[PDB]
Every structure is written in structure tokens, then in C-alpha cells.
A = this chain, B = another copy of it.
């Protein structure tokens, strides 16, 4: 329910940042994952959410996985990152303040 897999090169960065914010709001945590070239996206989303006070990381796992590859004839190996973020203590205030709604 709260998992985001980054793989669509058509999506703007803020699609993923905003989805991560929505999932943290709904579920308290969010899991981001990506392979290969998409790892830079997950890293950047995480940096943004940390530097701007929205999130605290709970788990960052990075590993090499086998990917089935028909044309190759045997699996290819790719790096995969998996990041779990939880809501920070400032998340609600910051989401409020975005729209000048802090009390």
C-alpha cells in the first residue's frame, strides 16, 4: 500500500516526492525502491525529505540482485536500493505551513 517503485522516466521528480509525502501522511511510513539508473531518484527524494524536515530514515538497504533477462540468456545483475522513511515530528507542522495553516 505504501510502496513506491521508481522506474518510469516520464515522471517528474516531484511526483515521487509528493507520493512519498502522501504515503507518510496516510501510513506513517513509506518504502521507496529502485534499480540502476533510478537509484539516483530515490536518493534525491530521500535527501529532499530529510533536509526539509519531513522524514527520518529507518532503513536503507542496497544490494545486487539477479534480474531475469531473456535476450541475455541468463540473469543480469543490477543494484537495487530500498529505503523506508517515517514521518518526522515536524511533518504535520510543515505540511500545514506549506499553506500558511500553522497555529
A residues apposed to B, CB below 8 Å:
6-7, 9-15, 34-41, 43-44, 46-48, 50-52, 57, 60-64, 67, 69, 76-79, 81
Contact = CB atoms under 8 A, between A and B. Distances in A.
Contacts of A79: 43, 46-47, 60
29 contacts: A6-B9, A7-B9, A9-B38, A9-B78, A10-B35, A10-B69, A10-B76, A10-B78, A12-B36, A12-B48, A12-B51, A12-B76, A13-B48, A14-B48, A36-B44, A37-B37, A39-B39, A39-B40, A39-B43, A40-B40, A46-B64, A46-B79, A47-B64, A47-B79, A50-B64, A50-B77, A57-B64, A60-B79, A62-B62
Given A40-B40, A60-B63, A64-B60, A47 B9 contact: no
Contacts of A48: 12-14
A57 B88 CA distance: 33
